[PDB]
Design a protein around this nucleic acid. Structure first.
Ligand SMILES: [Mg+2]
Length: 679
RNA sequence: UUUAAAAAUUUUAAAAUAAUU
RNA sequence: AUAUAUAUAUAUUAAUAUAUAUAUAU
RNA sequence: AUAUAUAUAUAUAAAAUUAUUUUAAUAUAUAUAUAU
């Protein structure tokens, strides 16, 4: 038998990870008959072969492979070096080769200029000697056919796909498996009657993007002849822990209005890739739930779910939904009822944009729940780590509040430029009519005045504020539009974000804000008009990274020794220059065997000017604030491998638990240095 | 009966000088 | 005695900054 | 923890349009002619 899965299957590691409990199969037992297959090199060959050929030809060829039929290529050097190898060590010559050619190669002459051997080599071709010879222009369908029928195939090129490539001659003449009745691996085929494909995982959620292309192309042409089997059917047929790889499903639920004992389904939705660990933690299963529980504010485990995922779309009309944040009708979600779970798979929580250790700027619209998400995020501290303290995050209003006329006060006086308004309430009435969605022309006349305030005041103030903030440690900073972080030249990762709710209603729900609620809302419209359209991309994309890796590591280092499983890596200054103390800058947490490996890495080729001060901090541990400015290069994440759970924010500060006296401050030209205990 | 029209192609890849965006 | 071209032959392949180790002194 | 001398290694400076000038021995030896 043979089964194909949407994932890169390997015979070494895929047994360790399993992949079958991954996709949701109950293979767990003394099964030892589901033998995997090596498709790493096959994916690499597919990528290399799409470079020259066409995707349709390559995929429609590779689909007709009999993966349970062992075979192999072996490439020949070109004709010249081939003949050189025929000559030297001549007792390997196939008998097809011409009698004259063999009789002339068996001679010990220099072969400098043999008048007849030159002709005999000119009229010699490789294709006649070795029978199955693929081509330099094979037009690959015969490649897969010849791999299907036979044991060895002879190529004169490297662009081949289907099996491994073996060398024919020694390296000089070139330039620079048992079955188990339940074989599995990627790349479905239709070679036999027993090839099956495991359904249950959507096509748009496949993460590899080459397996994804292969599946799309094969499933749009061979839909009616493929054998689909779900994870339950596969289960019935059968019957250095990596962090940042989490299992995700999505929840199927509908809205219910249980008034006076009469159930009434109202709407059906899909939560779109909440991670499985959070559903396990919160104890979510098939039952009814109330998602407010008091005073019309969400119960906040529901808020955590909605903020840890992508967004929910209606199942009737396949479009996004954006559930209502208020508690006023027409639409109010007060009671839901989860009904099932569909496609499960792993994803890489580490975004590709994040490779170096640097600050993070998360742009959100105005009316989002930034305050409540901060209140909910500052509490988590898994292994005594405090993954996101409240002091490491920069509020969105801070850069505008630090001005003599603050920014919002500066824009409140904008009604003087209009032809005639005479008051802020008349401005809010002249802009949007008797609901939101203001008049676009009037909003444009207002934006032409709002813009110079944002380009001439806010940008110059922010260009200094973000520098001052970057000096004193990594911080997670928010904003109301990417243009704020782009005009003011912001350093760090620029993550746009978005929330699954209607943010414009929060601007009416919240009361005690400067100016009327209508003014806050018009201000949000102006920021949204100053936005430079680009994909906001689902706020949960960040919170999933923030939370998920720690929960997994808590299973591995839940009970080990804190001294043996810990570390900290900061800027070092020698015991002199007191006219040793290091600023932390990072706090690693990982098993002992990886701390041993991190203990020996360089960590010293990274420099920065640390400027210690003499100011005291109200916090308990007696410590003095400091600063630091990296010079040359930034710490890449590869050093802190995928097996440790580090922190993303940190303040710069030094503790002084010896001879308490703060003298004069200074700059010292620190050097990075690993700092753990004995372990 | 002897003479003659002859091809005006490119975008010419790099290295130095000068002018410009 | 010098050089140029003619035929052949032969060999042949073409500023600043930083890091590391040695030594001497503190 | 540092200073000086030494040795080794590394990083840094672009694209386009226009016009002009230069890019088939490397060397020697024998036989031929010529010039100084
Ligand atoms: Mg210019």
């Amino acid at each position: 038998a043979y089964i194909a899965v949407p994932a890169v299957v390997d015979s070494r590691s895929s047994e360790a990870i399993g992949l079958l409990e991954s996709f949701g199969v109950d293979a767990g037992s003394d099964a030892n008959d589901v033998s995997y297959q090596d498709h790493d090199y096959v994916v690499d060959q597919l990528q290399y072969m799409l470079d020259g050929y066409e995707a349709g030809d390559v995929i429609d060829a590779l689909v007709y492979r009999n993966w349970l039929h062992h075979s192999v290529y072996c490439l020949l050097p070109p004709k010249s070096q081939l003949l050189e190898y025929w000559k030297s060590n001549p007792s390997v010559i196939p008998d097809n080769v011409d009698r004259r050619l063999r009789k002339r190669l068996m001679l010990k002459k220099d072969l400098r200029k043999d008048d007849e051997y030159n002709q005999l080599a000119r009229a010699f071709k490789i294709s006649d000697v070795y029978a199955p010879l693929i081509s330099s222009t094979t037009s690959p369908m015969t490649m897969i056919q010849n791999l299907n029928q036979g044991e060895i195939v002879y190529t004169t090129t490297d662009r081949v796909i289907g099996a491994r490539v073996l060398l024919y001659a020694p390296r000089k003449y070139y330039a620079s498996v048992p079955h188990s009745r339940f074989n599995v691996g990627t790349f479905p085929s239709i070679a036999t009657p027993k090839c099956s494909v495991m359904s249950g995982v959507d096509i748009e959620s496949i993460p590899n993007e080459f397996i994804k292309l292969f599946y799309q192309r094969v499933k749009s042409i061979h839909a009616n002849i493929l054998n689909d089997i779900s994870p339950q059917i596969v289960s019935d047929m059968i019957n250095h822990v990596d962090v940042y790889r989490v299992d995700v499903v999505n929840v199927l639920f509908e809205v219910v209005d249980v008034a006076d004992g009469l159930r009434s389904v109202s709407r059906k939705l899909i939560m779109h890739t909440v991670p499985v660990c959070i559903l396990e933690l919160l104890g979510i299963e098939i039952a009814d739930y109330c998602i407010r529980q008091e005073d019309g504010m969400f119960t906040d485990w529901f808020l955590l779910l909605t903020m840890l995922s992508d967004g929910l779309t209606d199942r009737r009309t396949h479009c996004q939904y954006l559930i209502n944040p208020s508690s006023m009708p027409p639409d109010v979600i007060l009671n839901i009822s989860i009904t099932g779970f569909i496609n499960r798979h792993t994803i890489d929580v580490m975004p590709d944009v994040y490779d170096f250790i640097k600050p993070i700027g998360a742009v959100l619209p105005k009316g989002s729940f930034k305050s409540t998400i901060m209140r909910v995020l500052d509490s988590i501290s898994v292994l005594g780590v405090k993954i996101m303290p409240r002091a490491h995050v920069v509020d969105s209003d801070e850069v505008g509040e630090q001005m003599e006329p603050t920014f919002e006060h500066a824009v409140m006086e904008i009604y003087k430029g209009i032809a005639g308004v005479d008051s802020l309430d008349d401005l809010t009435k002249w802009v949007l009519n008797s609901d939101l969605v203001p008049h676009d022309d009037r909003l444009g006349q207002l934006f032409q005045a709002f813009l110079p305030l944002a380009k001439d005041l806010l940008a110059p103030m922010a260009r200094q504020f973000y520098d001052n903030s970057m000096s004193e440690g990594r911080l997670l900073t928010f904003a109301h539009a990417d243009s704020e972080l782009l005009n003011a030249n912001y350093f760090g990762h620029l993550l746009r974000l978005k929330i699954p709710y209607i943010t414009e209603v929060n601007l009416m729900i919240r009361k005690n804000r400067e100016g009327g609620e209508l003014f806050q809302l018009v201000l949000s419209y102006l920021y949204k008009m100053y936005a430079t359209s680009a994909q906001p991309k689902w706020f949960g994309s960040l919170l999933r990274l923030l939370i998920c890796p720690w929960l997994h590591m808590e299973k591995l280092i839940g009970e080990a020794d804190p001294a043996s499983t810990s570390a900290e890596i900061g800027w070092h200054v020698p015991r002199e220059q007191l006219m040793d103390g290091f600023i932390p800058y990072v706090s690693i947490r990982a098993p002992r065997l990886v701390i041993e490996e991190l203990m020996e890495k360089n960590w010293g080729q990274y420099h920065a000017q640390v400027i210690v001060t003499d100011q005291l901090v109200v916090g308990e541990p007696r410590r003095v604030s400091a600063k630091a400015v990296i010079k040359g290069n930034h710490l890449p994440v590869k050093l802190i491998s995928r097996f440790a759970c580090f922190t993303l924010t940190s303040k710069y500060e030094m503790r002084l638990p010896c001879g308490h006296s703060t003298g004069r401050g200074a700059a010292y030209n620190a050097r990075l240095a690993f700092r753990s205990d004995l372990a």
